[PDB]
Amino acid sequence: MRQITNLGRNIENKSFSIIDEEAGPHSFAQEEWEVVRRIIHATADFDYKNITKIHPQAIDSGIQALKKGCPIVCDVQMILSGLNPERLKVYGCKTYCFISDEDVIENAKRKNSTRAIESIQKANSFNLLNESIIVIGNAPTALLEIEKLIRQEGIKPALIVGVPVGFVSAKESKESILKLEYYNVTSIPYILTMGRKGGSTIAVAILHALLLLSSKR
Amino acid sequence: MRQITNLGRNIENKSFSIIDEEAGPHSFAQEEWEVVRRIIHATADFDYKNITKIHPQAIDSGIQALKKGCPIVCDVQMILSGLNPERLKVYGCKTYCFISDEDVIENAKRKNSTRAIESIQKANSFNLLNESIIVIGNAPTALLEIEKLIRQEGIKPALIVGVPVGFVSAKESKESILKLEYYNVTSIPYILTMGRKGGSTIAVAILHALLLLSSKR
Ligand SMILES: [Cl-]
Ligand SMILES: [Cl-]
Ligand SMILES: [Cl-]
Ligand SMILES: [Cl-]
Ligand SMILES: [Cl-]
Ligand SMILES: [Cl-]
Ligand SMILES: [Cl-]
Ligand SMILES: [Cl-]
Incomplete structure (x- = not known):
C-alpha cells in the first residue's frame, strides 16, 4: 500500500488543501484534478x-x-525507483528500463542515436509497448520514437505519460503526440505537460496519483 | 564515468547554451553558475x-x-538511484539512505514523527553526519532535524544540500539554516533553494554538477 507516518499523511493532506485553495478555479474533472494537483x-x-x-x-x-x-x-531509472513495489504487486505489473542495458548502449553509439531511443526500440522488439503504460519523463527522443512507432508500426500502448524535460526537442516531442490525436479518430490516451517542463518526479507524481485513483475502486 | 551517447551530449550543450542566453546576467561565480544552471x-x-x-x-x-x-x-532513495556509482567509486564515497529501514520505520511510528527524521537520527548514531555531504531533497523535517543537531549537538557536515520541496515546512526548514549561518561566525556550508520549491531531481543535479566540478581539478 504505502509506508508513511500519520504525521506525514497529515502534512500531505495539509499540502493538498493549500494547493487546492491557492490554484483557484480550474477546468479539470475530480479524477483528473487529483493528478494535476499531485504534480x-x-x-x-x-x-x-x-x-x-x-x-x-x-x-x-x-x-x-x-x-x-x-x-x-520507463526511460530513466529514477522513475522506477519511485514506485512502491508493494503497491504494484497487487496488480502484478512488470517494470522496465533498458536505458543502461549493455546492448542498448552498444546500438546507440553505433547508430549515433541516443540510449533512450534505443531502449524504446528494445521494449518494442519484445512487444512491451503493447497495451502498457509508457512513462517518458526525461528523454524527448524517447517520446518521439513512440510518436514514430505509432505511425510506422501500429504500437498501441494503454497510456503514454509524456512529461520529458528539455530545451531542444522536449516541446516538440509532446506537440507531436497531439498531432497524432488530430489525425486519428481513436488515438492513444495520454497525460503530458506541454513545453519544456517535466521530469522523473513529475512522472512518478502522475503514476502515484493514477494508482491511488485505481486503489479507490 | 558518464554513459551518454555522443548525440545526447550535443543535446545537453545546446541546452546549456540556451539556458545561458535566456537566463541573462546573473550574480553567480563561474563555478557556482554551473550548479545553478544544472538545476x-x-x-x-x-x-x-x-x-x-x-x-x-x-x-x-x-x-x-x-x-x-x-x-x-540522502533523505530519499530517489536520489541515490540517480547518481552514477561508477563516478563515486573513484573517490570511494559510500551512499546512505535509511528512510526505508525497519527500525527507522518503527521508531517513527512510535515517536509520532516521520520516517525522515528518524533516518536522520539513525544516520547520526553512526557518525555519518560529520564531514559528510547531507543531501535532503523531499522531507523538510529531515533538514529541520539536521538544523536541530547543529544546535543541540555539534554535528558538522561538510556540505548541506537542502532542497526539500514542500508546502508546510519547506520554506522554514531552509530558512533555519540561514539563521544558523547568521548566529554562527563559522557555519556549515550549504546549497539550498529558498522558498518551497525543490526535489530530489534538483538534489541530483546539484550533486552531479559538484562531481563534475571535482573532475576538473
Ligand atoms: Cl484549468
Ligand atoms: Cl532526448
Ligand atoms: Cl531536449
Ligand atoms: Cl529527469
Ligand atoms: Cl542572479
Ligand atoms: Cl517532512
Ligand atoms: Cl512541508
Ligand atoms: Cl522529490
Missing part, C-alpha cells in the same frame, strides 16, 4: 496547472491497464 | 536562478569532501 505537490510549481493535458480516456484506459497487471516501461 | 536544466525552470543560494564554502568544501570519499546521506 503541483511534487514540484511546488503551479505552472503544471496550465501545461498539463489529459486525454479524455487517459484515466480509465490507464487504471484499467494497471489492474490487468500491465507492464510499465 | 534550471533538470527542471526547465528559471526561478532557481533566484531562489538558489550557495554558501561561500559550499563548492570548495563539498568537492573536498567528495575527494576524500566522504559519506553521502
